Design a protein around this ligand. Structure first.
Ligand SMILES: O=c1[nH]c(=S)[nH]c2[nH]ncc12
Length: 149
């Protein structure tokens, strides 16, 4: 639907791939997330360089689920020294705030014809955790998720 995301002139969009639906549920409940060590650094740099000029959006998907499960906006820098063991595995260390926008399952069939020119033209549905999405393809994904019924 062209009602959604028609004014995102700046900003950046990443794929989040979780091993745990329970971690997603905790993220939705408390509006926080944590990535890999390298993923935290990549999101941190994107959020910091944006300096509030636009949104950093996160497109969430559970590994193996065959569907994306929602969209959240990054709402803080990464805090690296935080309470241990709050997620499904102890290896998830650190925290940043998010704001969930959509919580809805969207089948990969609706998205797999969107290909990423920064990832060897592979379907967006074949992305790994914290793959960055070109802005014009991200707008396409965001509108599909937003309007899917
Ligand atoms: O399974 C996960 N759980 C948390 S909390 N963060 C993640 N990043 N990538 C995968 C995961």
């Amino acid at each position: 639907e062209n009602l959604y995301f028609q004014h995102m002139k700046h900003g950046r969009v990443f794929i989040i791939k979780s091993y745990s639906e329970d971690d997603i549920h905790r993220s939705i409940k408390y509006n926080i997330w944590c990535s890999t060590e390298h993923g935290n650094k990549r999101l941190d740099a994107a959020y910091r360089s944006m300096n509030g000029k636009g949104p950093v959006y996160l497109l969430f998907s559970v590994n193996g689920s065959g569907h994306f499960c929602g969209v959240a906006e990054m709402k803080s820098a990464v805090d690296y020294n935080t309470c241990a063991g709050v997620w499904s595995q102890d290896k998830w260390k650190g925290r940043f705030d998010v704001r969930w926008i959509f919580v809805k399952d969207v089948p990969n069939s609706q998205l797999r014809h969107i290909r990423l020119e920064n990832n060897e033209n592979k379907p967006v549905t074949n992305s790994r955790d914290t793959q960055e999405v070109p802005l014009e393809k991200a707008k396409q994904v965001l509108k599909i998720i937003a309007s899917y019924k």
